[PDB]
Homo-oligomer: A and B are copies of this chain.
Amino acid sequence: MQTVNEMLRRAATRAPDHCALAVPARGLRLTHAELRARVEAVAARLHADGLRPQQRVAVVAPNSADVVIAILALHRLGAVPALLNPRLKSAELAELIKRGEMTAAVIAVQVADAIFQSGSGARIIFLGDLVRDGEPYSYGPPIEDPQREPAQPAFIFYTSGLPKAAIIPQRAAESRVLFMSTQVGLRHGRHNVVLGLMPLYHVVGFFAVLVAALALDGTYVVVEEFRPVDALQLVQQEQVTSLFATPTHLDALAAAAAHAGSSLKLDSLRHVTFAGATMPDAVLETVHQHLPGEKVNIYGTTEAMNSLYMRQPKTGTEMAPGFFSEVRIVRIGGGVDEIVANGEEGELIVAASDSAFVGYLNQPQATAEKLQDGWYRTSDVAVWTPEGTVRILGRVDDMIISGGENIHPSEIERVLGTAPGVTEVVVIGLADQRWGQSVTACVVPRLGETLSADALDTFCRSSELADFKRPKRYFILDQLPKNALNKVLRRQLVQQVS
């Protein structure tokens, strides 16, 4: 097996003087050999300070060359980095560090004061004390390479109450990189220039983007702050060959690319990759229209990485398993062998092979729910189409059951999203008078526009929606309740309207 460390080690023997890390705004460029030397330097310093293999170390920082070096240094030492979203609230981060029994926390700095008040025994390490614009503070003797074993913890990543600590074993790294070759069509070579739009604390941003970029002897371009015009200019200046972005970022990029008066040259870009399950047909058409390269839709989890994909997608919900993957659709709430009959809806489950996590840290119960008899349960509903592909229908937990029939809010939300005057929509089930749920739509008007239940119903009646799927009721609201991460709080919304 090639661990992350080993893939990078091998790449550096092959392409020592080729650019590995580029930070164009900062004018910082490091070769594969230069990066390896700085990783080794930081690792040695961390070891001298007391850090030992298989100890867990939290990382709380936005994307940057310094955090790339820190994460890889921790891994080189043999510590287990636990990458955390720095946009989370301080007390929430402190709780997770406490729950995780971390030896230390490497932070970009009032998070430290929060860790001190939690009672945690985690030693605070400021990122700025380790490495500054690629330059390490060097000390301590050279250190041994730790023994890495296939099933052993390598990295911890967090999911969407509190986020769960998914443990990624050493053996998972290779296939979490190589799917980008088998599915997406990346190949080895010094032509590879990868734009780092995805967060490093997301499995895609780390394995599929950063690690893939370097493992294939290419360049990772660091983007600290997202700006659509700045990103497209970087495509031209750095000759970016591939980008992985969110639907939100892609919509922004497509719009910035759409001007006739623009001098932008996007010719180098050959791959545009995304998780487009939630992507409306309209966003997908603008991506096809205004951005070059092959478009590939992927379906992925923190827990299992890549399970389905589609080249040149026409919609965001239709995909099929690729290399590495084995999938089934089973009776909702049933055992892993209870295969549905074709055309019937069930839960998508995916074989837990080398890419799969080994469990959630200190949560035995949640693990038992997700990993059963060699299979990872997605908690998503799906169906086999007449063409033998998988149609993702939505989350099991979002499903509305009205008169004993399954309705998926995501489908209704996509239709209603295109109705005149609608800027936002969330579809929920509210309790009816016959022990079921009634389909209910909460809608926000475009600025200055007037919505009415009658006009929205008139629009739904003209659509392809089956009768039983049309909302029975509308709530017209000035705004929807959202957390600090711009995610709709479905449960708080039910309470506000009901």
Residues of A within 8 A of B (CB): 1-2, 10, 13-14, 17, 178, 181-185, 187-189, 215-216, 311, 320-326, 351, 353-354, 388
Q: Contact partner of A323 among B183, B216, B322, B351, CB < 8 A?
A: B216
Instruction: List chain B residues, Cβ under 8 A from A325.
Output: 10, 14
Known: A178-B178, A182-B216. A188 touches B10 (CB 8 A): no
* Minimum CB–CB distance for A414 against chain B, Å: 28
Please give the distance in Å from A369's CB to the nearest CB on chain B.
Answer: 24
Residue in B14, B181, B184, B326 whose CB lies within 8 Å of A182: B181
> Bound state CA distance, A40 and B265, in angstroms?
55
Cross-chain contact B183 with A187 (CB below 8 angstroms): yes
Q: How many copies does the complex hold?
A: 2
Complex Cα distance, B2 from A1, in Å, reads 11
Main secondary structure of the interface of A (DSSP, over half): loop
Contact at A323–B13, with CB atoms within 8 Å?
A: no
Q: How far is the CA of A178 from the CA of B183 in the complex (A)?
A: 12
Nearest 3 A/B pairs, CB to CB: A188-B323, A182-B188, A188-B322
- Of chain B, the residue at the smallest CB distance from A178 is B178
Neighbouring B residues of A353 by C-beta, 8 Å: 2
What are some 13 contacts across the A-B interface (CB < 8 A)?
A1-B1, A13-B326, A14-B320, A14-B321, A17-B388, A178-B178, A181-B181, A181-B182, A181-B187, A182-B187, A184-B187, A185-B185, A188-B323
Residues of B within 8 A of A10 (CB): 324-326, 351
With A2-B354, A10-B324 given, can you name 19 additional A-B contacts, CB distance below 8 Å? A1-B1, A1-B354, A2-B324, A10-B325, A14-B320, A14-B325, A17-B388, A178-B182, A181-B181, A181-B182, A182-B187, A182-B188, A183-B187, A184-B187, A185-B185, A185-B187, A188-B322, A215-B323, A216-B323
Please give, as numbers and ranges, the residues of chain B lying within 8 Å of A388 by CB-CB distance: 17
- Chain B residues whose C-beta falls within 8 Å of the C-beta of A189 in the assembled complex: 311, 322
- Residue in B closest to A177 when the chains form the complex, CB atoms: B323
Among A2, A178, A181, A185, max chain B CB count under 10 A is at A181
List of B residues within 8 angstroms of A187 by Cβ: 181-185
Q: For the complex, what is the distance from the CA of A388 to the CA of B187, rounded to whole Å?
A: 20
Complex CA–CA separation, A259 to B215 (angstroms): 44
A45 to B476, CA, bound (A): 70
- Least Cβ–Cβ distance between A24 and chain B, in angstroms: 25
Question: How far is A311 from B217 in the complex, measured between Cα atoms in Å?
Answer: 15
Given the interface contacts A189-B311, A311-B189, does A326 sit within 8 Å of B14 by beta carbon? yes
